[PDB]
Amino acid sequence: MIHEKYTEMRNEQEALLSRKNTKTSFYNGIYDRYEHPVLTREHIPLHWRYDLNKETNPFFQERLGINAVFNAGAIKLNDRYCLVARVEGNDRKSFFAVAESDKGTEGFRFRQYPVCLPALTDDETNVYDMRLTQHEDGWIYGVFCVEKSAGTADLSEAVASAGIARTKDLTNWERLPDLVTLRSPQQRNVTLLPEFVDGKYAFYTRPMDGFIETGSGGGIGFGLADDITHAVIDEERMTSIRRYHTITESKNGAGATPIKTERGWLNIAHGVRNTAAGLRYVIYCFVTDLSEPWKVIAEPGGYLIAPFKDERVGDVSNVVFTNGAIVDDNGDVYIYYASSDTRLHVAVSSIDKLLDYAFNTPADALRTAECVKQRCDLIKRNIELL
Amino acid sequence: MIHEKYTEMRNEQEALLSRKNTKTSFYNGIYDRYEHPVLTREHIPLHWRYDLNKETNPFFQERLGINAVFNAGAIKLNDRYCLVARVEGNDRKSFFAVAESDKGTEGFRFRQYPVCLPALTDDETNVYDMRLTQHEDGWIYGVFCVEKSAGTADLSEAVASAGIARTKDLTNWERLPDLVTLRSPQQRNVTLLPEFVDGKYAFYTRPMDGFIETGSGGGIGFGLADDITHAVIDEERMTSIRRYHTITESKNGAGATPIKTERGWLNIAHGVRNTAAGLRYVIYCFVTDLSEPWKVIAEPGGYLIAPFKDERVGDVSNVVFTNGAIVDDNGDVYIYYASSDTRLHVAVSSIDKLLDYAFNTPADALRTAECVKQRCDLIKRNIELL
Amino acid sequence: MIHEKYTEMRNEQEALLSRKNTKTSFYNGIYDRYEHPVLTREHIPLHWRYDLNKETNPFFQERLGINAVFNAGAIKLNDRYCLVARVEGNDRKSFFAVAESDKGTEGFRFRQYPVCLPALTDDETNVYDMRLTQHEDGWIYGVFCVEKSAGTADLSEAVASAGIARTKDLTNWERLPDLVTLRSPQQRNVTLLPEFVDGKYAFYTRPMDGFIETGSGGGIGFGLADDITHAVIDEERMTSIRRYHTITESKNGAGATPIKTERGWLNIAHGVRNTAAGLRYVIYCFVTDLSEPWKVIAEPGGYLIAPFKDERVGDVSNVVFTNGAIVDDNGDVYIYYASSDTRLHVAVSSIDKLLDYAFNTPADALRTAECVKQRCDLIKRNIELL
Incomplete structure (x- = not known):
């Protein structure tokens, strides 16, 4: 009672829904960025959007579209990475839905229903x-x-x-x-x-x-x-x-x-x-x-974090925004920041790294002159090395 | 009395002005998107912009530039697809100019003069x-x-x-x-x-x-x-x-x-x-x-329609805007939407498709809770299939 | 006393800091655009940003980041192209720093310290x-x-x-x-x-x-x-x-x-x-x-100049802005325009070209009708050629 593009689309989803994520050449000594987002509007299951019954929907059209999934709460429940993501539909309302994984940089899959x-x-x-x-x-x-x-x-x-x-x-x-x-x-x-x-x-x-x-x-x-x-x-x-x-x-x-x-x-x-x-x-x-x-x-x-490369553009461009993070027992840290109110990415760090930053990265010098002196000092003691 | 880059530029235009348009992997069951726009600022004839006389314009510079062509009225006159497009020059004023084709997804060519x-x-x-x-x-x-x-x-x-x-x-x-x-x-x-x-x-x-x-x-x-x-x-x-x-x-x-x-x-x-x-x-x-x-x-x-991929960026970004559509006798429908106030694209549908959408796509539930219930119901009867 | 990624990063910089710049297919008869910017945040020397001492900075993190370099004064001092660029750090303050080259389209290198x-x-x-x-x-x-x-x-x-x-x-x-x-x-x-x-x-x-x-x-x-x-x-x-x-x-x-x-x-x-x-x-x-x-x-x-292609997007998008230009003795002209308040590009022209434009490019007709007549006249005398 199917309509038969569904099988094929469901097949491409699974490929995206299992797509391997790789680390990027990005460096700053603090966090790592990755090639693909961990959640998109493409990640939402098609039976949340499509009616697969061939009788009431003959052309197989999308009846309830998803426009974005972004700003997501994060928590490790038992030993699964859980993302309570903000999902926005075509009608501009947002709702919550949980996605789960065991790697935290990839493989996230939504639950059976969205959050009630x-x-x-x-x-x-x-x-x-x-x-x-x-x-x-x-x-x-x-x-x-x-x-x-x-x-x-x-x-x-x-x-x-x-x-x-x-x-x-x-x-x-x-x-x-x-x-x-x-x-x-x-x-x-x-x-x-x-x-x-x-x-x-x-x-x-x-x-x-x-x-x-x-x-x-x-x-x-x-x-x-x-x-x-x-x-x-x-x-x-x-x-x-x-x-x-x-x-x-x-x-x-x-x-x-x-x-x-x-x-x-x-x-x-x-x-x-x-x-x-x-x-x-x-x-x-x-x-x-x-x-x-x-x-x-x-x-x-x-x-x-600031918007970087293709993070720059979306529905509300030049926005990065984190709702939540996941901290492993060993020291691993996962930060779930959305870009441009359209997609959710992941930044990977550690407690000691993120603590090195904030205590040891200089506070705001607030004015251009003092900022210049502040940078000059660092330049001056980097040259008193070589 | 020519200046002789003109011949070469006129040759590259013709290649763009005849460039074949292909359909995109985009699906939603309602309309189809295409790889290239049907009209750009590159589509405007060079003798609307350049003075080809070698005596009064020696470096062969553009004297009257075009910044954008967008929001376009559409009508099928006789058996040609006619696009009365809004053309914006470098001086920020807009004017109308007609472009014609026989396929509607490609091959559009402006007239001899713009609209008086x-x-x-x-x-x-x-x-x-x-x-x-x-x-x-x-x-x-x-x-x-x-x-x-x-x-x-x-x-x-x-x-x-x-x-x-x-x-x-x-x-x-x-x-x-x-x-x-x-x-x-x-x-x-x-x-x-x-x-x-x-x-x-x-x-x-x-x-x-x-x-x-x-x-x-x-x-x-x-x-x-x-x-x-x-x-x-x-x-x-x-x-x-x-x-x-x-x-x-x-x-x-x-x-x-x-x-x-x-x-x-x-x-x-x-x-x-x-x-x-x-x-x-x-x-x-x-x-x-x-x-x-x-x-x-x-x-x-x-x-x-919403701005999608490279449609997102232009002079007025995150804008899609239709001025006009073309309906064939058999049921074919062509929608001419501009993106970011810079280029004109085409979306292809049918009357029955576009009528399936609007009568059968659910009305606005207006609030997040009722929206969630509305989506939940669909999920609940898609699972009562398999 | 080094930390040893530094050597490698310093090696990739040099490749960017020496990266050859090429001219683009862009034409209008007046200026030429180039494939790469002449200055980016990547151009700033790493010892302005990183502390290479392994004892006070163990993870080798960036202590003073650069967010942008743009709007740059230009002057030819002796026979070097000098760019007094506006450098913005992560703390949102801007300061001046000089970069020098002998080609003007590539090879720009900052000085030892920034401008005091x-x-x-x-x-x-x-x-x-x-x-x-x-x-x-x-x-x-x-x-x-x-x-x-x-x-x-x-x-x-x-x-x-x-x-x-x-x-x-x-x-x-x-x-x-x-x-x-x-x-x-x-x-x-x-x-x-x-x-x-x-x-x-x-x-x-x-x-x-x-x-x-x-x-x-x-x-x-x-x-x-x-x-x-x-x-x-x-x-x-x-x-x-x-x-x-x-x-x-x-x-x-x-x-x-x-x-x-x-x-x-x-x-x-x-x-x-x-x-x-x-x-x-x-x-x-x-x-x-x-x-x-x-x-x-x-x-x-x-x-x-207007924002064009990837010039369109940055921290303040759809912005082009020149601070300064360099005029050679022979007639060569270099214009240093920034895009989207993030990077600095170069446009190449001549005095006679830039003078052809402004005296001979028509003044503003101010209203759509007169603009149309103005363009129509040009079309009308381009056809009275062939």
Whole structure:
């Protein structure tokens, strides 16, 4: 009852869905880039898009297209690499779907169905950018962006909030109430630390007036929540603050979930600046203190990832954006950054490498003269070698 | 009296001007894409650009360059495929020029001269995006955008209007007065149906306050004109309306001229949304009622064409835009969409295919949860097959 | 004391740093384009970026990255082609560095250190787009943009000014006070003519309210300065003025330093227009009068260079921008235009070619009808040949 191109297409998918990934000539001493993305719109199973019944669909047309899969939460569940990816269909709404692999640089395959998540309100128009936390309390939390319309004359005006839901398998989800932030009407780039702080749940947040425009409101705020089941945040202490003429000028916020090291919380975050061609996103790093995570103790100058070569172009071009990372027990680190809001790539590093960077890469000299002196010094002691 | 590179360049043109076009591996069950565009700036004849006289131009330089040819009206005149293309020169003004072929996917060649069209006013700065209607009244109408300056401090501020002119050969044009819309100071994406409605001329329009910003003013309005020779439209009834978080959020409007089918008027239109990198244009479809063309009876969720691969980049990137289509007698359909305001491509479909899409592709579920359920159902009945 | 990838990387650089450049099939009768850029971020010496000491940098990571090198002043010092390039690091600040060659289309190599330039104030955040003038007074002046923050709530709000500094070798620089313009709070695209005018120093300027938005304020103004050591400009006489629906609509300004010919000052300048995808920059030309440089005597319609093929994409895409040019004694001309604020290319022409263009390429007909007639006439006298 098939229609018979299906067999052939299903055959080409499998070839892509198993396509071997290779490392690129790219070097900087910190991470490695790879030739192919780990997830594309081509990766979504065809029976999520096509109706294979020959009677109600005779030409064999795509009934529900996928436009993009990007910004993806990452977590290692048991011994499989799990990517809770943001999948965007042709209708512009995004939803979550899990993809699994055993190598982390290739072989990712979506599950049987996409992720089901109870709407709390009925004006929840779409959800995105989930960050995954394997907390010490036993659960796995997904904290994600919830976008609703503002009832205004401007059809484009929408309000953003932060929603929380818990799982243990990634199939079943318990939708907890949305996080409340009392000194901030909207929230973006919210994420939960894997450990308690003063016997409470710890968040990184971005307070803001709403919703394209950051408020006052300098950057990434640290907040404590008494109970996650009814999460409330009265204060948000400032950590990474945006600075004029840095990589953070217009915006900045958390990316991958905080990663615990012996020297502190490694936050692979993102910064936004305004350019003549629109907004430019890049991926930078910063380390906060283990016993005091509101305290930035490492913060290099500039960025770690920027759009590079064919990463430059997509639906929202000159954007790189990480939602999540995977840390192996031996020291291996996998960073899942999307490019141009169209595809998901992988960058490979280690804890010691990523810690070498941030403590030892020089902080921002902030002004051209001091920057020149800063570079001159390095040149001056590289020549006092040969 | 030649200068003698001309012979060689004229020889390479002919090779491009006759270059065979091939179909691409692209599939979705609805249309086919092709390897090469049907018209580029390279297609314009060199004696429109170069002065071949060796005395007044010794280095053989280009005196009047072409920067782009895009958004093109389409009509089958006699048995030739005719493309009234928008040609933009280096001086940023656009004008119309006709290109003809007998295959429709290749071999397009411009005429002897470009299209001459009487300015009605003397502050008509430029004209563009003509839609061609072979009306039942005998004539062929070109309804197009007329752009004038607003006498304001902002040099960029301009007013848009809709101009009409009739022909039978595409060489000679009778400029009729500009369409008047009384409940709307400006007009874009205006087009004329091939049949009468209540013994009158039928338009699709986009009412608007002006001119980058849509007013109130929800979308594509249907209007009746008593006489085309002095065209007046008092009311515009709303058809396709823009919706929050759809493909239409910021803007939307007509594309190719309405195409009559047995089930209704097939309108291949366009939608615009705001992104961090600027505005994104896509091509979608909707069907209105034969006896009541203000009544949308089919309207799928999402789009039909979006910028794809090297279509992504040009002078105004991430734009696809159709001005016109060509329908053969047997059922063949040719859609002429431009990419990034630089080149004109072709998409090949049929009436029954394009009708399968729009009636049977699911309408917009509007919110992520309902979208997920909508996709889940399809997945659930594709598995109840194998 | 080396770490030993360095030797290998240093070996690949040398191959790029010596890579032969070839001419492209590109033709228009005026300039030639080349296959490779003359300067990239790959061109910067690795000991400006890497710490080769194995003890303080064990993984051999890049400590001070380069994100781009673009908009470059050009001057022939003795018999070497010198490019004072704008180098941008990962921290978003720009600085100047000199690169030298003997062919001008290839083989460019940076100096030992980057350019040292005394900050006059301590809130000078960054400097860029230096134009180089070998004046008749003996010196070489660099007039460049100085960007400071405005002490406002908007972190993005910055004020621009024009700074001057003199040299004879390009290593040592005497920072003179910033140019004062009394009828204009900010200045961009300022440059100095190589000759005196009425026994004074002659500037082209762009007066402006600040700083993304041009004021009133029509375009490129000519100004006279009594003494360069304390440079003051009371009046700026208008030359090239921006016009609605031209290549100059939103912005325009000087590019390469004025080039003296027998028929006038050849100014290879730039124009900016607003598009749905952001701002579009192109390179155009105009000639002013030798004894009266505020008087435009040649000004063709449109542009000379626009973003082409892979020039289209970078950090600020659809931008071409020249800072400087090199004129040989025999008639050879080298134009150093950057693309998309990422790389620096070269266009090759001659004085007589570039003079043929501007006097003989038709001026702007300003409106579509007159443009069509203008092109029609040329077509009409190209056919009255064969």
